C-alpha cells in the first residue's frame, strides 16, 4: 500500500500520487539530448527520474534509482509522486511497496 506520510507529502505539491504501479522497464541513457533515468509501467507509461549533482539530491536521487531498479528486477510495486508538467512526467518521490 501507500504510507500516509508518502500521500500527505505528495499532496503538499503540484505532483500527482500514482499508487501500486508495476514497473517493467528501467533505462539509463547518456545520449546528448535524452540523458537520464526512465522507468516504464506494464501499461507502457514512462517517467523520468531527475539526477542530483549536490547534497542532498545526489544521495536521494541515488536511492530513488535503487528503489526503481529493485521494483523492476524483483517485480514489486511502487508508489510515485509525479509532476505532469513534463513529458515524460518527472518523479519527485518514490516509495517501494512490495505487499
Amino acid at each position: 500500500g501507500v504510507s500516509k506520510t508518502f500521500k500527505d507529502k505528495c499532496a503538499s505539491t503540484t505532483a500527482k500520487l500514482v499508487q501500486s504501479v508495476q514497473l517493467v522497464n528501467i533505462s539509463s541513457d547518456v545520449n546528448k539530448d535524452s540523458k537520464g533515468i526512465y522507468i516504464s509501467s506494464s501499461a507502457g507509461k514512462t517517467w523520468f527520474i531527475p539526477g542530483g549533482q549536490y547534497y542532498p539530491d545526489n544521495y536521494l536521487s541515488n536511492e530513488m534509482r535503487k528503489i526503481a531498479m529493485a521494483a523492476v528486477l524483483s517485480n514489486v510495486r511502487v508508489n510515485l509522486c509525479a509532476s505532469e508538467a513534463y513529458t515524460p512526467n518527472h518523479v519527485w518521490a518514490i516509495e517501494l511497496a512490495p505487499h
Copy 2:
C-alpha cells in the same frame, strides 16, 4: 532479536529502542519541503532516516539506508534506535535482524 551492544548503545542516548519492526515501505523524496528517506512499518508508523554530508555520517547514513532497503525488499525485521523529539521520529541507529 536485538544485539546487546545495539540495546546498550541506544540506552546511552535520548532515543528509544524499537524491537523487531517489519518495514513494508521505504521512500526517497526530493521535494523542496520534504527531502529525505522515510520508512514505514506494517502498523503504519513512519520514521525519517537523516542524511550525512561529511565523514563518517556520509557512509554510516548510507549503510542505514542499505539496511532499511533490504528489510523492505526481503521482508526481514530490524531494530531501531529512534528519537521521539521529531515527527516523524528520526532513526539514529538501525540493526538488520533477520532471524
Copy 3:
C-alpha cells in the same frame, strides 16, 4: 519488451536499437589498451559501455553497469541503443526488460 520512449530516444541518434538481448557475460578490464566494461550476448556479440568522469555521465554510466550486471547475473533481457561506429559497438543507452 522495449518501452516506446527507449525506442524513440534511440531513433533520435545514429545508434541502432538492439531488442531483447540475453547478456551472458560482463567484464571489467583495467589493462592499459583495453580499459572498460564489456558485455556479451549468448550469440557471442560484445559491446562496450563507456564510463563517465563527470556529472551526469558518472551516475548514468554507473546505472548502465548495474542494469548490465543484473541482466547477466539474473539472466534477464535488455534493450540496447548501440553505435556501430566502434568495435566493439558502444552502448549509449540500456533498458532492463525482464518480462
Copy 4:
C-alpha cells in the same frame, strides 16, 4: 572454509582468526558516542568494523561492510581477522566463505 592466504595474513598481525562465523546482525549507528558499524554472530559475539576516510581504507572498509551485510542477509559464513585490543574487537580483515 578459510583461504590459506587469509589465515597467513592474519597470523602476521596481533589479531586473532575467527573461522566460519555466522553473522545474524549488522547495524549502523550515527549516535555521537557510538558512531560505527557493528556485526554480531549467532553465538552472541559482537565486532566493530572501522571506517576509512582516505584511499585505500575508504574502498576496503566499504568492501568489508558489503561482505558483512551479505553474510547477514544471505545467512552465509565469514572468517574474521579481529584485534582483541578493543571491546568490541575491531575487524581488520573479513572473508566471505559461503560453503
Copy 5:
C-alpha cells in the same frame, strides 16, 4: 564460457587467461602489510584485485570487485586475466560467466 573479446584483450598483455574459475572466498584486508581485496578458487589458488584511486581505475576496480563478490555469493563462474609477475597473481580483468 569466455567471450572472444575477453580472450583476445587478455592475449594482448603479459597476463594469462584463467577460464571457468569457481571463486569460493573474497576478502577485504586493511592490515598495514596486506591491504587489499583477495579472491580464492575452490582449488585453493588466491588472486589479488588491485585498487584504483583515480578515474577510470576507481570505477573499473569497483566493477571487478562487484563481479568477484557476485561470483562468490551466487556460486557462479568467472574468467580471469591474471599477471603471474606477482604473488598472489594480480587480476587485470574479470568476466562474470554464469552459464
